[PDB]
Design a protein around this nucleic acid. Sequence first.
RNA 1: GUUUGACCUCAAAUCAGGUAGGAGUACCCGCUGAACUCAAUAAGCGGAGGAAAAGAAACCAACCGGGAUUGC
RNA 2: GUUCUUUGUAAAGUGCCUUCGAAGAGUCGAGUUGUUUAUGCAGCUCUAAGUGGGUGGUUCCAUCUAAAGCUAA
RNA 3: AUGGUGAA
Lengths: 314, 155, 81, 158, 226
Amino acid sequence: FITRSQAVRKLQVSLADFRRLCIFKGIYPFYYAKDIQYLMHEPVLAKFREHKTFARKLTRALGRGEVSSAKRLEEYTLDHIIKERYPSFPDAIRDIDDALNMLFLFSNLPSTNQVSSKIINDAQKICNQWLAYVAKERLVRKVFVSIKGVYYQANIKGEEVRWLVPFKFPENIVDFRIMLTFLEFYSTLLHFVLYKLYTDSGLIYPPKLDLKKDKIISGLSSYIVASLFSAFVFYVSREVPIDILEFLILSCGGNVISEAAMDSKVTHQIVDRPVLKRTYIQPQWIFDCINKGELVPANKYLPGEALPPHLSPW
Amino acid sequence: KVPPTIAQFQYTLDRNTAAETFKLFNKYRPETAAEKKERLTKEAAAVAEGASPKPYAVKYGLNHVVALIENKKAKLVLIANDVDPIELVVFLPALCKKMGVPYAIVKGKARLGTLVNQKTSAVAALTEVEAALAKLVSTIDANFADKYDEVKKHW
Amino acid sequence: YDLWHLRAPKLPPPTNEESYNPPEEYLLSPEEKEAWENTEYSERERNFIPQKYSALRKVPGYGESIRERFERSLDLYLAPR
Amino acid sequence: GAYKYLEELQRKKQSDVLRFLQRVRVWEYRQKNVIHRAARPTRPDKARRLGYKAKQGFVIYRVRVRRGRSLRATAEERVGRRAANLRVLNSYWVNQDSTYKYFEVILVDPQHKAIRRDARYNWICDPVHKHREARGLTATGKKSRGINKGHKLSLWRY
Amino acid sequence: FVRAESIVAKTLATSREKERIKRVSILEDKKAKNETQHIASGKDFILKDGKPALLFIVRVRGPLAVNIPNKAFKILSLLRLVETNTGVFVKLTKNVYPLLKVIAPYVVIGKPSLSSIRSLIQKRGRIIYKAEPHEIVLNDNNIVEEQLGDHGIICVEDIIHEIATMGESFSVCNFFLQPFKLNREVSGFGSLNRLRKIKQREAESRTRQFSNAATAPVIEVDIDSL
RNA sequence: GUUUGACCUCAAAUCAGGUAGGAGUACCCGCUGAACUCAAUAAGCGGAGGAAAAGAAACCAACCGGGAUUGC
RNA sequence: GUUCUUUGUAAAGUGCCUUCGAAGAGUCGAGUUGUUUAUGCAGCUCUAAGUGGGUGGUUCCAUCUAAAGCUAA
RNA sequence: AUGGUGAA
């Protein structure tokens, strides 16, 4: 065993890059020598050294001038680490339950100096694929509406991922650098996981997507318990999030029409206002039905009535 | 004690005029190896499938720069102060003065070379330019060649 | 292209009556909520404050989501396992 | 070329400029070790006319020898001893002192592929030229041997 | 101490800006009078009218450090877009139409989208009120239900609808929103940031160009860029 | 703009690509060099090859010119 | 001999007209002190010329271009 | 004399 400082000196790699290497691989107690020896043989060290040399050469060019050289100088993924930490696809799905919370949180974070707009765009786009896949296999089984958010539980081949959907409200902003590395690793994992899931679903990947619809709602309505709400069509009022209600109905096999679409079999209308003028129903009815497949009539969730005690479904 | 022929350097062009000279020289930076190679590849591709004005660039090589000097082809000469072999540049100001060519001294050979791609250039010169060259030459004259015309004195 | 000390990570326990519409009995008194808020960090047991909201539009946005994720990040790679 | 002027400048060694340069460089040379690598030749014209080139594989050395055997040959042998893998093609004076004399020596690497790959200098890689300074085959060695031009028992079968 | 070049450059830029503003104002004064007899043009057009249209505006930095001019400075103060990277939605009108040219060099305008507006509202928002220096974000709809909602704007979705549909409460909500301070592009300096900024600056010249012509068509660019 | 990078120099590598030691020594190339003018001999020192070295004139020539170096 | 290639406003030579047109410095040399078979070398103060300089013998003539280097017989 | 050997 060697000290953390001793291991860093042996690797002669700054602590900033050692954090990334440990996060990708995982080393902890003071630390066993064998883990450090295995890490030293990883190819990621060569790539990190190449990146450092690229940065120093770019700085040299910028200081000397001739910006053309810096532009011309501009000419990786941790695939190997994925296999090591995830020997098999079921292991990756198991690790998803805690890994993907960071990605889903980042999907709604605002752009700032600490996070580039590209990272947020990629995180949001990853959701557009995750929800699209989940709305085709109809693996949604829980819809606990928690204060932290709607605690979704998609039965991803029997591991019941506990991913949480943060609310659409502004998430006002800790060392994001570690969070950035975790997000990068989770996105690299998500690329292959989504590829595998789409290949299993039988749909040609990558499939076509619609952008005009994206410019209207920007979400699941693009990029092309289960027995509930068959062929059901619900109207959403101006007091509910379409991003959540529409996904559940689409997974169930129904359809949703947005009130703000211009900002029939209409069996129900989701409304929360005390004043109303379709079967008017509170949003709690859909969640309660999905949580247990009750398919209870609307009589138990008329607007303005006392809400029932929604015990946590766990 | 330094002889009068030495110490002509170290006393160099002022900050503003030096910056203006650097900016003017940056307008005629010679094509770098990568740019020249890509231009030649493009020309070959165009000719291989389906006659230009004479180029202009700064003169930097000591041998050919001196060759242009004496022939009166050097419109302006810029010399570095920190050159290790002083004898390489001791006679250059004297030759420029004898031939009647504007000349100037700068501090930092590496900064001199940074505008000509090469790591170091020792000296630099210009053969052709648009019209600010005359103003820069007049400024350099009035600030170094005429104001410090007594360089032959002191020790 | 499709490419297809290791103890269990011990995932955190699931939700515990933090619903936006929880049972009335689970809405603890302010004194207990104040004690939980003032409880020393790390040693704190519960990761949420009890609350109830009837109207869906009245549900507040979680502000502690980032902090919980950051806390779990440490265990995600610094855990001795 | 600058060499045309550099040669003439170096001709008048007693001139003030060269006198100042020599006394400035003597202290720097003294502060250096007895034998030390020189990044560039202090007399580029002399080296270039001596066949030295700035291309890769050429190395310039400097060495100090006590004043009072030929000094040039002794310096060449001393540099060759330390520089076993290099060949002392030639050497030339650069500076002199009351107690010591300084001679610059240019070394050519025969193992370097650049030197072996050109026909203008590949001849030096032959084993015959090994330790050229040891046998006094250099310019100083030949002069010391007296190889000038001009005046300057056997029994057969029958 | 400051070098001479800066003062001369600032003076030259200010002179050109003042001349352009004066010419534009004088031409617009004659155009409004409808004489349209000895002027370059009388009609208006946009290339890539004064009809109603909700547009998004972003305060860009530059041009060079021109001293604050009275007309443009006051116009920006009306929209309180003094800070760079700040934007606000304004109702396009014939009276407001000349304001675009008045503050064209300092701002970029375009037609937003429903998705973009929704994302901007749900991701950013300020309520500077009850000492009341707090920059509280739109965390909950309780503030919207209490302070707002007198006209029926009870939740954030109502604000989005009013902004996109130009409702009666558009003026009230827009003032309440305390327009958002959008993050700058590069938002960095150092080894990589310098090159990234230099590369990005090239697009600014080809995108944020001012013809300075009195009858120049309104400059418009898609808001999808950000 | 007290931050910075260049250029110049000084160090380090269980880093990558390379080389000298030693032996033989008849011949060869330089230093040194003793005694019955002996002798620029012997011994000693350093360096190489199959030969070594020299080699294409600041040479010899006083001729009606020869014309790299070395051996008889 | 047999062949696949021969190339791009690519290279060289020769006579005619014309314009240009370099040469190894603490080195030769000189004095001295040690060596040498009265040549040369070495230590040292001085150390220069380019219609210039090195070697020679007759009233100043003949030859050559040194202070860098490779080369089988 | 040369080059080595050893000892109180």
